[PDB]
């Protein structure tokens, strides 16, 4: 569903 926000992937 959502895109990653812990690192700038």
């Amino acid at each position: 569903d959502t895109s990653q926000t812990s690192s700038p992937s």
Epitope: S3, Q4, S7, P8
Partner: antibody, heavy 114, light 112 residues
Framework: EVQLVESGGGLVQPGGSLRLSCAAS????????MNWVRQAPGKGLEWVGQ??????????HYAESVKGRFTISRDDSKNSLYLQMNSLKTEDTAVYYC?????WGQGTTVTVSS | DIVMTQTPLSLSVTPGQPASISCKSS???????????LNWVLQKPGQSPQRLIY???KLDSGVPDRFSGSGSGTDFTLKISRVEAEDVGVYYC????????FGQGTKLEIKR
Amino acid sequence: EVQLVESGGGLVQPGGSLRLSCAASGFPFSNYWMNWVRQAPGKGLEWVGQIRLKSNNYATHYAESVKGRFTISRDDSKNSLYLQMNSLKTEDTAVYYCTPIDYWGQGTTVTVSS
Amino acid sequence: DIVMTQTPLSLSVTPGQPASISCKSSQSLLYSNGKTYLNWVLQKPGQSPQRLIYLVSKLDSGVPDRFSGSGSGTDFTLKISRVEAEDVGVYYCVQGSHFHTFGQGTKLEIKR
């Protein structure tokens, strides 16, 4: 449901090797940088190594304390993450988490002893 | 490498009262894409870690609004406005601007 499930933890001799695996569901795995993080008994969290995307050529990088001994790999077709651990030491004893940092599972426990 | 300096190492807070945790980074966490990758995770006693805060100030789902995150560059703060019993555990900051590293952890107990 987001799920991350580690396996392959166990007891192994100092100097032995072990290979951990990890399956994931419920998020776009193939668009996510994937990590191993560990926690030695009774201590903090420690990033071990990272693997980036296909469009990054699956670039990998490692904590200085495991560099040259561990290898992270992935397989986006299986939504899987792997850690090959060679030349294991006593201080590699930990719970090992397969994580993008956004999401976490239960972990698999690695004990390095004689 | 970016070293994360978290203080205090422990907090003992009466419910109703606030808690504050500092995380400082040895270099800027400002990424080249204009975003700042500072995250806070909570590891509740006997549980796996779980993220609470991402991109400095944003709350993950299910996180009470008593939780807030602030800061920029090298300086960040987690605030809990009115501690409740469920807040107990070890908090860690974790930067994602240069791979990942974690704060040393802040153990929160309830004062009674």
